[PDB]
From a paper:
In order to achieve the proof‐of‐concept objectives, we chose a 24‐mer human H‐chain ferritin (HuHF) nanocage as starting materials; subsequently its original Asp residues nearby the C3 symmetry axes were mutated into Phe, and the resulting mutant is referred to as 3FF. One ferritin molecule consists of six C2 rotation axes, four C3 rotation axes, and three C4 rotation axes. Here, by a combination of the multiple, symmetric interaction sites on the outer surface of protein nanocages and the tunable features of phenylalanine‐phenylalanine interactions, a protein engineering approach is reported to construct a variety of superstructures with shape anisotropy, including 3D cubic, 2D hexagonal layered, and 1D rod‐like crystalline protein nanocage arrays by using one single protein building block.
Numbering used by the authors:
A (entry chain D), B (entry chain K), C (entry chain P), D (entry chain X), E (entry chain C), F (entry chain V): 5 to 176
The structure:
Amino acid sequence: TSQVRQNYHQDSEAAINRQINLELYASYVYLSMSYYFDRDDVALKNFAKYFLHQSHEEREHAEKLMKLQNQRGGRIFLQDIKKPDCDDWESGLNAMECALHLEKNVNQSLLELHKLATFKNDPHLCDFIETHYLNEQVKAIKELGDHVTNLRKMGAPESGLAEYLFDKHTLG
Amino acid sequence: TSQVRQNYHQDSEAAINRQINLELYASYVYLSMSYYFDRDDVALKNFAKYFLHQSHEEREHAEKLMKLQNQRGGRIFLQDIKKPDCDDWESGLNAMECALHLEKNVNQSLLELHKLATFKNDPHLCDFIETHYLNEQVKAIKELGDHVTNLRKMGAPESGLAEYLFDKHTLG
Amino acid sequence: TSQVRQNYHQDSEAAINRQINLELYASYVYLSMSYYFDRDDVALKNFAKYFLHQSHEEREHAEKLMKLQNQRGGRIFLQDIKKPDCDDWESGLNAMECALHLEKNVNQSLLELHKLATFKNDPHLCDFIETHYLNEQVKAIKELGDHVTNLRKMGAPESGLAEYLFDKHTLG
Amino acid sequence: TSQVRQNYHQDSEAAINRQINLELYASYVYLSMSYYFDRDDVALKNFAKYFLHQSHEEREHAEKLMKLQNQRGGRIFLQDIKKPDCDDWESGLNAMECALHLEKNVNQSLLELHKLATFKNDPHLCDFIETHYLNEQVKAIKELGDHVTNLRKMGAPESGLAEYLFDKHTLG
Amino acid sequence: TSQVRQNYHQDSEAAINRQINLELYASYVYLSMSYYFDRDDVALKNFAKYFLHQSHEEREHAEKLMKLQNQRGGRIFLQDIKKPDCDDWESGLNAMECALHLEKNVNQSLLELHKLATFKNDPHLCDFIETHYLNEQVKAIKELGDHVTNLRKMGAPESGLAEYLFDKHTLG
Amino acid sequence: TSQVRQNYHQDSEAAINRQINLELYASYVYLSMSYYFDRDDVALKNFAKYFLHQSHEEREHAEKLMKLQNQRGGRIFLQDIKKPDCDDWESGLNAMECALHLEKNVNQSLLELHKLATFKNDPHLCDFIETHYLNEQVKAIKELGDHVTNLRKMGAPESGLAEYLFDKHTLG
Ligand SMILES: [Fe+3]
Ligand SMILES: [Fe+3]
Ligand SMILES: [Fe+3]
């Protein structure tokens, strides 16, 4: 065991050791979503960094995790960072959606990982959780909810001017 | 009667609260509209702050009044702030229309009001409006109809692209 | 079903907008008070500015929730705000004795919702209550509730000097 | 009757008079440890300020737990402030093993405090603990339980040198 | 024995260390006074600032003695610290009667401790009081008198419309 | 194909894809290294930084590879980023002998790589890695074998004194 461990349960840190690779993938796809746009025939640069931002801000997410488990007597078990689902993510709107697809997910589990300490009696995990991560996605799911809305009304993916004026007046 | 009372009439006294409560309704629909534009299936953001500046203006109108009754001896008689019947606002263009519409009709109720002060021979209360109001809503319907003019001559409402570009360049 | 909605139960969404109107119930009636002492036959300075203040600090309190609807998938729904029944607040004492009632009503309403917030296991909302609301309406009852012991310790509402003194000096 | 109390069960106030004490039994327990290293026979001063800084946070602890007490109508019944059972804190290693051990037995008293505030429906304190008292001692449990290792890994008490090189590197 | 002990008896070490559970005992009384006017049925919070001010300068004299006790190679022997004798300080004047009463239970203590210094012939322990303690503990008796007198002459306690003028103009 | 491919083979473009992986296999190692050391049963603080910071720095080693592909109109195929070979880096002594074998492997992943641009006559490749990538990692091999020899003189591992001070002095 450890010396700082207290009110910490092995079925809880096991989910923490599960959230860790769950944040690492998002970064890895976000990151795949970045350079997808660096490409010549692709060529929307301001998309990318939006996905490079939230891949970078993604990295501090995965750290704050690692911090608690140490804060709390949990060791750290690392397995593999799987490869993305697609490498060709097609449509300038496909990405925002596929992004939204994965933001819902973290937010789900994060609301599943919340309830676990709701009944193993760990209200400390109900502060660093109820404060540092929820509204993170709630506004991220909120933002990518206005984003996808706009391309569509712009006429995306059938409009090509949609992903230019976006990549300028929303992402500039 | 009070102490500051002079020249003043029960009628115009009575009409201001009619013309006070409605600045709140105005701001309440400006507010109602403002956040309908936050919807995920909207993503019209400078449209939101537009009508949110307007509510905090049409709120100021309600304040830019209530002391005047206490500056002359009349007491305040408010009634129920009723909502609008168009909970959902269809299009920015359409919202401008209703916005315009009410403004146009809040306007006349200020014309109405002036015309009564003119009757009971109250030159001050005519110039409180002179100094503070009719010289303002005139300004409003001008660029209001200007907003139609663009979007209605751009291609909107059936142009979910013109809404995008009307905003990033007119609303801010 | 909005595309930004994940566990936002029907009762909760139908209750966020219940409070909002209640939230806008206060903002209105506070402002009734903010103009009783603007009455000439009343004439107390900073008893209108403390309420003018809240009347906008309740204004803001509502807006933090109309986002939340749109932020959790919820469609805002709007209702009639009713006029205050008290045409007169007698004296500045009973006023705060009516804002204590208010600030107290606002609480069990938060609670009974933060019950249902836990009911449908929406903790996002739960921590949201606790911050801008649970945490503030406590001291907003310690604040307002201190402004009452002294007033009657001074000698209000009988002796009318206490009102002069508390208006200048505590509010200075 | 207490004119501010509201959803504040009486079983919660009794365990706070009992807990404020507990955070004052540790300001004084710090106030011993802060001079045993002052003393010229040990003379570890960067040790001294540590437990003299700690002697101000845990005084700041028991002091916010009392502003709140009047902010919910809870009444403060003080009790005796007993000394500890140990006095010449053998080393610095051991002079921290107690500093930690004595605090773990505050989080536990807080975890059961969050627990008791849960069984009797009080989210204002549960959030109050959530924010002002949860992570802090996780920091402290971190702030101490690690030191212990480095202390141990250099060679204390086998080396009174360590307590010095640790003194003026870790604590300046 | 102490390598640094020189001309320092042991009733000295016993009476210093006897006169530290009297300077501190004052800190604990002022703080209860502080969180008495923190109360909602009292609600005067400059009284409280005051006694939080005596809560801490009379918390710094122990810091003098403890070093002093190690200045002089003596050891520290702590005991319990009682709660003060009242939990409800009755009134605002009467929290000042007693305040002027205890600093006289500590003056003559430190005065009739000033003699044993002369016994063991230890003028260090003499001059150490003739400035750093006794010059400023006969000031704090002087001021409370003016406070108590002002109190009994401003009309305490019969005139409740009074002891709030003192809370504002003198204490603030 | 590519509207910009030039002199840019298949076999060329190959390794880029699989070296991206490697600099991802590495930042993931420094990732865990940094937090093995953040464990209280290790607690060597600024050990964390050194390895954290070189995870943030060998991170950009990949992005700038994943940017070259694009530039020359290459194609990305991000494979899985696997788990670290050891999960308990024993001590600072081992947890650094690893970096050494590691970065030499990464280096020889490029010595034997760069010469592809040589057979395939990729001059833009024969200098980029020279300028942006090679020496930056020779300026990290040295940066470790200067700790590695330090710790063999400071008695590591058998001298657990050696680990504490390298923190504040070399890496503080
Ligand atoms: Fe997150
Ligand atoms: Fe309020
Ligand atoms: Fe409030």
